[PDB]
Each structure stands twice: as structure tokens, then as C-alpha cells.
Write an enzyme that holds these catalytic residues in place. Sequence first.
Site, PDB file in Angstrom:
ATOM      1  N   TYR B 249       6.817   1.088   8.535  1.00  0.00           N
ATOM      2  CA  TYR B 249       5.632   1.411   7.872  1.00  0.00           C
ATOM      3  C   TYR B 249       5.148   2.810   8.896  1.00  0.00           C
ATOM      4  CZ  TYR B 249       0.542   0.417   7.578  1.00  0.00           C
ATOM      5  OH  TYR B 249      -0.352   0.258   7.412  1.00  0.00           O
ATOM      6  N   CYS B 250       4.719   3.288   7.088  1.00  0.00           N
ATOM      7  CA  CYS B 250       4.218   5.141   7.211  1.00  0.00           C
ATOM      8  C   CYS B 250       5.406   5.284   7.925  1.00  0.00           C
ATOM      9  CB  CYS B 250       3.043   5.235   8.433  1.00  0.00           C
ATOM     10  SG  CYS B 250       3.179   6.384   9.063  1.00  0.00           S
ATOM     11  N   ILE B 251       5.143   6.195   8.814  1.00  0.00           N
ATOM     12  CA  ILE B 251       6.056   7.039   9.959  1.00  0.00           C
ATOM     13  C   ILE B 251       7.758   6.321  10.514  1.00  0.00           C
ATOM     14  CG2 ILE B 251       5.650   7.527  12.184  1.00  0.00           C
ATOM     15  CD1 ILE B 251       6.291  10.324   9.582  1.00  0.00           C
ATOM     16  N   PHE B 276       7.406  -0.078   4.158  1.00  0.00           N
ATOM     17  CA  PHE B 276       5.841   0.225   3.672  1.00  0.00           C
ATOM     18  C   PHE B 276       4.961   1.691   3.398  1.00  0.00           C
ATOM     19  CE2 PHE B 276       5.892  -3.698   6.172  1.00  0.00           C
ATOM     20  CZ  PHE B 276       6.455  -4.409   5.451  1.00  0.00           C
TER      21      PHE B 276
END
Lengths: 525, 494, 545
Positions: B249-251, B276
Site C-alpha cells: 500500500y502506497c509506500i 495499491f
Amino acid sequence: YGPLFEALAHYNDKLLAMAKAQTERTAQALQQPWQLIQAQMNWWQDQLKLMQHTLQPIYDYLKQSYLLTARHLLASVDALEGVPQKSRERLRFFTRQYVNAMAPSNFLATNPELLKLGQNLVRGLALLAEDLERSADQLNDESAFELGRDLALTPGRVVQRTELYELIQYSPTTETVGKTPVLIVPPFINKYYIMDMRPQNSLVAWLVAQGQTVFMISWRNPGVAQAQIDLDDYVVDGVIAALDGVEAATGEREVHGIGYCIGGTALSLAMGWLAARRQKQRVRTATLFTTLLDFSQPGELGIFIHEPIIAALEAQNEAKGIMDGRQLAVSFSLLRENSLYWNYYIDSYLKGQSPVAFDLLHWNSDSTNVAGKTHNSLLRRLYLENQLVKGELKIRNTRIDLGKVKTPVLLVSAVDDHIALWQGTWQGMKLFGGEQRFLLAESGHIAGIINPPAANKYGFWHNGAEAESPESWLAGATHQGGSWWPEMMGFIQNRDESEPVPARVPEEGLAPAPGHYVKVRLNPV
Amino acid sequence: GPLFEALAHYNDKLLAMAKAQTERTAQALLQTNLDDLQPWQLIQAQMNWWQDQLKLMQHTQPIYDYLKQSYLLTARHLLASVDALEGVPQKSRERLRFFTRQYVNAMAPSNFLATNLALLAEDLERSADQLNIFELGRDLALTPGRVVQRTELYELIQYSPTTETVGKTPVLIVPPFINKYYIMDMRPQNSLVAWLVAQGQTVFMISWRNPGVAQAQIDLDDYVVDGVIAALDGVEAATGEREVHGIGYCIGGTALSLAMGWLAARRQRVRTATLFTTLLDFSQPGELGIFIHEPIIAALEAQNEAKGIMDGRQLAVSFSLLLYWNYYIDSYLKGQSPVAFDLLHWNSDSTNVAHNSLLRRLYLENQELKIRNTRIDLGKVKTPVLLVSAVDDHIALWQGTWQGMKLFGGEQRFLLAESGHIAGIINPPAANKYGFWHNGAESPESWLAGATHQGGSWWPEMMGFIQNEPVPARVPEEGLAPAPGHYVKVRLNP
Amino acid sequence: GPLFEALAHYNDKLLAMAKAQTERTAQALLQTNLSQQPWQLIQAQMNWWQDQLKLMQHTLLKSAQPIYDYLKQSYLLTARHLLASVDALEGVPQKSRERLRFFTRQYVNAMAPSNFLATNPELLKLTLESDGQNLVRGLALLAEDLERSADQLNIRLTDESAFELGRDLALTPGRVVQRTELYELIQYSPTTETVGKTPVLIVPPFINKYYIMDMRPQNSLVAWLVAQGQTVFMISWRNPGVAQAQIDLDDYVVDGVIAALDGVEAATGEREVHGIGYCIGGTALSLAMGWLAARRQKQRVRTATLFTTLLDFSQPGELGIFIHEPIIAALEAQNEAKGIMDGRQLAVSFSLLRENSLYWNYYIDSYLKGQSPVAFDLLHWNSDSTNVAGKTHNSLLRRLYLENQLVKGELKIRNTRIDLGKVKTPVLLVSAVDDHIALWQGTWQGMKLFGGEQRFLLAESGHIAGIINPPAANKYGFWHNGAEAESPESWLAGATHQGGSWWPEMMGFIQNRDSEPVPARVPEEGLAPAPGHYVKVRLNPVFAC
């Protein structure tokens, strides 16, 4: 498109100056908070800026506008934390009163559906009437205002009490007063203390300070026992009987008359009744505030002036006995000033005063009944048939001809009046057979009339020459800033001139200054 | 016009809920023993404002007339709202005041630096602090499980199974370390962790520690080796499987990408990789590009090394990761507690970051990247990759995430959610609220031009992506602590 | 002399019952191949009354050791009474015996003055300047001891009562047309082809349950009013629990009585009803009329008949023993602590059933009339206690009983000053001469408070017997006087006595102030059948739902 931004900035500068003034007063020590007004001023500026930015996109503005009202809610409630709850409840009640007063759908005269709408129209009128009255009942807290303490506090005595009125004689407050007394005839549709609200804007107090003995008729709030009281009775048993009451208390058979709205109409009919029967002139001067004698221009109230509607109302009155003022309170509004919030709440707060819009809303909601026969005569003989102009009106079997009246009359009307259109009031001025003068106030039905000299808030138009039409009169009229009350005082004292008489101290009478008839409320508090 | 119709749909849905509440109170009068003991009117007050204001706009000095009538509608909204809260207890009303003030500020562009330098930040930071003057495991992050390993950087959570059989390959989730992980574990109705477990999948969760001053020298390289790779060794210790299904997720997905490259570049464990809103190409940084400049990055690098870590309360004021209609109104009409409350609580539950490598080596240099003196080449990764991005994403532009997909050397698929950075991701199949765009053919704009809308949640598509032999349900060991752990409960503002 | 004649009359009626029972048992043997207590049990009691009276006359004539002789022979008479009673119950099934044992125990404890706080001699001593604050504890100790004995007696019981609401009592057909937090509105189904246009609304007291006015078909006021062509509505108050702790007297007036008036209009379309109130229920009806008048609202009560209604609490009767500042302040603290006033605690404080002839006129006489003993039904109602909200009780103790605000014009219902002089509804006050709860002179004083027509009636019995006197009963009488008097004694001096029931006088009072007959209103399906659910909630339950 621009002037709004500059004008809003001017109001913000006065609040910022008031905020600095409040901090300086707090420094010397060591009501509504300025943060509550700042919360509202912030909403007005940001909404205009967002509108200017706009000048799916509709939704974006809707979302951003919804954010501004949310900021308005949060900033307002946060300001109300230090305010005691009782004072805060007063603000909630009056804001609910103000928010419904500005909805045109809440009044029959300005209701869209009634404008859209024979017997089917009459049936639908009753449907709109019952719904609005029900909504008013549920909305109508307590302990808002007490007469004699917050409003109608000018000192005086009740020198006479009849079935129809209580006669108030006010304390002189001057060493010398004029020989000719002053009698004020208020309308019997609302209560009189609109002319005696607070000492700073009380017309009664101002007239008293000008060395004049002031009498005030205080009409009884009519119950079912007064079902047969007619317009004829209010003229003879109301105004003329009050004239006999003034003579009984001062020994003067001649007074200066002042009338307001329908109260001036009664004053005009009283002068015509005394003239038609060749009685010695008992009214020296007659000042008439927004009085309707020619009913050809009824304004927004003309929606009710129709044969099926008037016939239906006549049946209701005769059935219930009297016209319920709570039904009249939803029918039309006597208080519809343009920018009441800006000039009588924001401006009134920045002057250090308690909000005048609170007092005006309490008076507007202090509704009074009307006698059954009186309302009908007012609906049919005056509004529908217009008998007064056609010379067909009869007061106790006496045909009224205002041309037989030689009393100098001064009609003071308001340009923004929605109840008594100034043009209509101008046409009725020519009906008189003596000296005629006309004044045109700058504000509305209530604001343009109650403008004390100290406020310096509006102006008026005066024209001594005669014209053939209201438009011609105004075209030749000269504007003067400030209040017109000194002009009325000049109109009275330039015609009696009479040596000043020692100040008439009122007798003890039957009751204190405000009286008992004015305290009778339809919805008790 | 269509806006009126959608408002009518909400008004009828509110009326049906109002009838349901009146019937429940009528039935409540029947069952009331002697010895024991938000209102719809408040939402109705909101719907009254929305519909009437649209009517006023359709109707339209003339400008002053619109302003006065608009101010009258705001007055009715204020009066109806306060009146609707008559029976509500004062404690409950304070919650409504607290969360509505958060939403007001969160949607105010001036309250965040990116949407409005250190001096301006200090004033903005103070404004949040003066304003400051849900419980994990009960209201949020309540999925049952155990903490099977706790290191300096993370707590590994293994969740208890809800199916008799689960897949052999376990699933490991790598959350971002800019905010807390429990956005993926909100409530049982919108918990991705609970959904994956119900799909017969053993789920492991990395729970990053809220870093203090003791972690001043912890670098992005450490999160790759000592964070992601070390977690893989922990998963094998609990299941015996050297290969897991990866989710980022993200980073967190960026770290997983570097972790896959690090094992690949050194010729050494990840079956699938779902990412994501993962940023590998930083050519379109969005609104955060205002900070990506040599004078600004150099100033921040000195501040971060001096204080040891950058205060997360300062990062919360830099930009906002966070809606009224779909997560407050819709969540209320669905019988749930307002999800917008949980999202605002999570966004304000910021966590610290040690970071300079992220500013310069990734945002500025856009590497050439070396993790622990090992050159990173995503082309060496043959793991199937799935990029799930958002159209309304304001942190990670979906075009930048699409271009970074081509760095991988194996199977690649792209999905584009119909909402923002968080709403388009946390969309359970039971919600049936949003959709996605998919395109099987191989520029970012060209893909979207040929993409087809399907609607619903993309979680079944992701579950199909992963599952395309059942093993008995793995009951987690006792471990060190119950499900939520201790690292996630460390708050900057207690 | 007269006592001997009355016993002979009852003994002759018992002989007729014995013949009726022998014929009934002989016919019962014919109906074969597939209740009433035996007359010998009543004969056993009548033998004691006659023999004890004869012994009393013999010893009084002997006066014109002797004390022991009367004591010894009286103990022999008590012994004969025990043997004759048990022998009379030879064929009786055990359940019936336990039924009779339960009711005899109820009547015995009800007639002991020490068993009630209001009539307890010990509490009377502590009141005569023999305490102050220690009275609180002196009262609390007497309360717990009386309550403890009741608790021990009740806990031993393992069976529910022989009477079931809707089957044995409160069985008049009807429907529950509205259910709110405070009440269930019952609309009774009609028994006449045509009914009056103006419906009738009954406001019962909220200290006990309403079905005292709907006991049995022969003595049900509701059934009688329905048979008189009246659409009858009945308020059935909820038995308040801890959830209703903050319900005040103001709420029962506005949300109880006024809200029921809106419910009657919702079911009949009539904004004006005939009001009937009982005890404290009539006080609420009076306060409801004043509240509508003070706010200048259209008159919704056409006529108002008030049974034993207290508006002036200057003569509280025996309940004045509790009306003292330390006691009321102490009771207010307990009601705020516990949430509600426990009706089981109220059951030991005073008794609403204190008729001077419960045994003779409602047990012996009702038995010889072929009826099930009415004293049994009265004892169930009296023991079917109900709670009172903590706030409502307090207001009743202080604002009404202690301060007497209604008379002093200080009473406010929801910030609305109440002035009964503003009420122009014609009122008919029906009080009882032997009333111990609402003294008839105190009820007379409150009549003058109204500003409209006023009428007064004085029934010839007690608080319960003089009110629930069916015309068919042909028992007792009443006093009527149309003229105005300056004092209660002046009223009675000019009053004319009439025998029989006063119910037609109330019906005449209602029907002389009313329109045109309307077809019989069939009640809507509503929410529940006739008795409802609120009235079935008992403070002391055995079993469960």
C-alpha cells in the site's frame, strides 16, 4: 457587482473598531460577543468571494458553500459558550422568528400558491390558512419582553378607561408645555407601543420632550364580548370620546391630532363626522402617518379584496364573533423592512444598543384581535366598495365628506411602504378641504416613521407646492437628510401660534403608565 | 437536474429509515421490564439545506437577493440542527462537534501547506495544537489474531482463520509507514484483512513501529532488508512457507518492489505482488512537488538529522490524505456508525518518520537506486505485478503509477479505482458502491481510453488474480501479544 | 337488638342457599359419565357472630373472675369456629382452600391498623413533637419491618392469582388504539346501535391500576357507560420502571391527558370529549383543563366529572402523617436514588381499600347473592400495586400535598401558571362521605376554584364502595344540592338524599350539556385486544413471559 464588497468592508471596519473599543474598555476594568457577529460577517464575505470565483461545477459550488455554512455554525456556537443560556435562548427564539418572517410563503399575502389560486378559491384559501396557523402555534418560549419595563416605559397615568380604550396621559418632563394638547390615535390592528418602544426611539417621549402634553389612546384587545363593535363605534365612541376625555383632564376642547395607519383613518373620519354635523372644530392640526383614505391601491393586500373571499371572511367573523389576530398574523406582516438584519440588527449592535430587530419582532408578534363588525366594515365599506372617496361612507347615519374638514392635515408616508402605498396616501390628501402638506419618508412602513432625530439614519422629501399627481409632487420635492419629526413639530407649532401654559401633571387616574389593555396578549407569556 | 434526482433518492432513503426507527421505538414499548432501562432529523436538516439551495440556484440588487436568501437557508440549517440534537446527550453532542470541526478543517485548503515556509508551518502547526486542547482493538483494528514476532521496526500479526480450509501460500501485507496500518483493518464490514481471511487466505500483517528519537539513523534501506525481508523470515518461522503472496500500500508497495528487486539482483520468495497506488516513477508527484526542490530538500535534510525524526504532527499539516455523501451520509443510511469518523480519526492519528532518502533518492533523483550497496533493477523481477490506482488520487497520480508498472520484467496488470487515494481502495464487495477500469490490451491515456467499466469492488478481481492445494486452517501461535499489538497504539497526542 | 335481627335475616338467606346447593348437587349427579365456598363455612362464621353476641348480652346483664369467664367462653367460641370451618372444607379441593387461605390472610392483614404506616400507632407517637430527623429513621425502620414481612409472605407463594386480567377482571371488549410511553388508550367496542357524538375519556389514578372501574360485567362502570350509548375511551397508564424516573406531574398532564385527547380525535374526529377523572386522575384532568385555558387554546373538554378529586390539599386526612418537611425531603432523596417510588413500599404506607363493610356487604352479602365474593376482586385490585415515577411522586408530595400550589396559584405545568378560574368547563364533583383518602370537605373546597358551572355530589359510602355502585346493585345512596353554599356543612344541610346509585345523575349531567346521535363507532383494529399490556405488568411476578 463590487459595491457589495466595499460596503461589506465598511461594516467589517466598524466591528473591528468596536472590537478594539471593547478591548480598551476591558483594559480600564483591569450583550452579544463581537465574535458572534464576526462569525456572520465572515460568512457574507467568503460566500461573495466564492461566487466571484465562479463568475459538476454546480456541485463544486454547493460543496464549497456547504463548507461555509458549516464554518458559520461552528464559529457561532463557539461564541455562545460564555453567554448564559437564558440570553442565548432569547437569541435562538428571535432568530427563529426572523427566519420565518423573511419567507414569503409563510404569509398569505405573499404566498405563491394563493397567488396561483370562486368557491374553489375560497376553499383553498382556508387550506392555506389552517396550515400556516398550525405551524405558528407550535413555534409560538416565554419571558421575551415585559411592557412597562423594556417597552412602553414612558412615564404617565391612565386617566380614563372605556370599553374600547384606555386614555394615557404622559408626564410633562418640561417646565412649560403648549396650550393645545396632543392626542395620538394608534391603529387597532396592532398595539400602540410601536410609537413608544424605547426612550431613544419613542415618539411619545420625543413629543413630551418638545413641551407638549401627549395623550395616547390604548385600544382594548377585543374579545367575543365586542363582536358588534363597528368602525362607526371606533370613530364616535373611540376617537371623539377620547377628545371628550382630553377636555375632561385638561380643559381644552381643541387638540393636535396624530394618527397611524388605520388610526389616522379613524382620525380623518372623526374630523369629517364633526364637520358634517357642524360642530366646533376640536382638532387643530392633524398629522396622519401612512393613513389610507383612498383604497384604490391596496398593495399586496388586494389579493383578499374579492367578493367570494370577503363574503367568506364576513361569515367567519360573524360566526367566531371577532377576527382572531393569530389568524391575521399569518395573513400579512406589518413589519417588512428591507435589510432588517443589516440596519436594525448589525447596525443596532454596533451602536451599543440592544438589537432593535428584537423589539420590532416582539411588537409584530404581539397580535391583537379585531371586532367582527369592524373588520367587515373595513373589508367591504372601505377596501372593497371604497365608500370614503365616493362620498357614500356613513358613520352613525352621517355621510362623511372630508372636503368639509378645514383642519390643516399633514400626511407623512413612506416610499417603501407595503401596507399603505404612498401614492395611495397622496391621493387621499386632496380629499381634505383645508391646508394640505405631504411628507415622504425614506424607509418602510415602520422604519421610515419611527426615525428619532438622534439616529440620523434616513431622510425625507418635502414639497410645499401643489401637484396634479404623486409623480409630479415627488419630481418637485426637495430631499432633506435626517428625521422628519422636527418638521412635524414645526407643522404643529407654526399653526397654534398661543402662550405657553404650565406643565400639566397627570392625575392619579385608574392605572399606571402602560395600562392593562396593552398587556393583554393573544398567546399569554 | 440529475442532482435533484440523487437528492430525492437520499430523501426517500432517509424517510424509510425514519419509518424503521419509529416502528422500532413502538416495538420497544412492548419489551420494557421495570428493573432495567445520530437522529434522522439532524440528517434531514442537512438534506433540507442541499435541496433548497439547489432550488435557489435554479431560480437565479440581484446578487444581494441571492445572498440574503442563501443566508436564510443557512439560518434554517443552524436552527434545525440544534433543535434536532435536543434529546442527544451532551457527551454525544461533543463528539459531533469534535468530528465536524475536523472535517471542516480537513477540507479547508489553507490549513495544509500543500493546498495553501517554516514560519507559515509553525503558525499552522500551532493552530492544530490549540485545537487539540475510538480505541484500537475495540472500535478499529479488531480483527482477531496474534503477534507472532516483534522486532525493532515492526510487529508481525497473524490473524485467526474464519474458514475450515485456507490456501497453502500465506499472504503478507506491507503497509505504508507515513500513516498507520489499520486503514486496511477498520471495521468487520470494511476490513480488507477480514475479507482476505474469509476467502480462505492466511493473512500476515506488518505493523510498523511509531519511530521515536532512537530511530534517527534508520534509513529506507533498513525498511527493505530489516523490515520486509526480515518479515518474510518471520512468516516462514510461523508457517514453514518460504513463499508468500505480497500486498503493498502506497509506500509499503514501493518497499515491496525494492524487496523483490533486492532478492532478484542478488540471485536468491514472493509469488504474487499486489501494489495499491504504488509509486515507482516519480515524474508526476502531484501537489507534493512543491517541496521537491533543491533549496527546500536541503533545508529539510538538515532539520531531520538535527531533531532525529520529523514530527508527524508537522507532516499532518503539510498535506492531507483525506466523502461527506458516501462515507457520512451513505454510511449513516446503511445503519453503520459514520465511516467518515473513522477516516478522520485515522488521518489525525499520524505517525512519525525518520525519509531523506525518500525526498532526494526517490522524489528528486527518481532512481540507479541502490539498497544497501546493491543496484536495484526491477527488470530482474519476474513476479506477476498488479497496480491498483485511483482516478481522484491526490498523493499518487495514477499516470505515474501506470508508467512505473513497465519497470517490472514479468506479468503486469493495471486496475484503476473509481474514487480517491483511500476510498477507491477500501471498497468491500458487500458495499457495492464504486467500480474500476480494466483493459487486457497493452501510454497511460491510451490504456484508459480503451478501458471498460465494470462496477462493484475490485477485491474479487484481486482475489482471482492471486488464486489463479487447500491446507487446513492455520491457528496462530500464542506469540507475544493479542491482535492489535502495541506499536499501533503509540500516539503522538495522547 | 337490631344486631340479632340482622343476623336472623342473613341466617334465613343462608338456609335458602343450602337448599339451592342441595338441588344443584343433585342435578350435578345426573350430568355424569364425563367454586362456590360451601354454605357450612359461612354458617360456621354466622354461628360465631350470634353466639358471641349472646354471650356478650348475658355477661352485660350479669353485671347489672367474671372477666376470665367471658374470656374462657369466647375461647370456646373461637374453638368451635375453627372446628366448624375446617369441617366445612371437607370436600373442598386443596387449591380452593389455599385460595381461601390467601384471601383470609389478605383481609386480616388489611384490617390491622399497625400494618400501615399512615395508621400505625408507633409512627403517630414519633410525629407528635417526639422526633425531628430521627423521625426519618423511625419511619424507615417501621417501613422496612412492614415491607420485610410482606416480602417473606409473598416469596412463599408459588402460584399466580386466581384472577387474570381480560378473563376474570377488565374483560370489557375493546381495542388499544394508541400506545405511548405513558399510556395505552383503550377504545371499547359498542353495545348499542347508536352512540352519542361526543366521546367519553376516563382518566384513572396512576397510584393503582385502572380496572377498578372495569372489574366485572355487573359492576363495570365502563360497560355501563358503553351500554348508555357512549363511546368510551380509557387511559391505561404504564407501570413506571426505572426508565421513567424523570417523568413529572407536568408530563402526565401534557404528554398523558392532553396527548390522549389528541388520540381520541385521531380515532373519532372529535376535538371535544366528556372527561371523567378518579382520585389523582381527576386532579390531572383538572390540571389539563387549566393548562389548555391558560394558553388560550380551544376548549377540548365538554363536561368534567371528578371522582374523589383533590385540588385543595388542606385536609389530607390520614395521609397527612407523611406531609412534613423532614419526611418529604427524605422521601425525595429515596425517590431520586431508587429512580421510582416502589409501589410495594406504598402498599405498606396506606390502604386505598378501607370500607367499613367489606366483610358484610362485599363478602357475606355478595356470596348470598350467588356471586363470586366481590371482596376477593377488591383485594386483588388493592394488592395489584403500581410504581410511581420519582419526579412525579416528589411533585405530588411537595408541590401539591405540602405547598398546596394549586390553590395558592403558584403551580406551573411546563412553565405555565395554572388558574382553574380560567376554566369554564362545567364540573361535577362526586365524593364519598366515608372517604379516608380524599375527604369530601376537602374535595368540596376545590370545587369553587373553577370558573364555570359547578356541581357537587356526596355518595353514601367510602372511597371505593360509594364510587363503584352499579345502578343494578340498588345499594347505598347519594346527596344532591343544586344551590350554591358558603361551606361544606351548609351544602349538606341543604342537600336532598336519594337512594340507589348516582351514576344516572352523572349521565344526566353529561347528556344535558350535549347534538345528534351518530352510528355506533366500531373501534379500529389498533395495536392489541381490549385489556392491553400495560395493566398486566405486576410488581411482584411469579413465572415469566
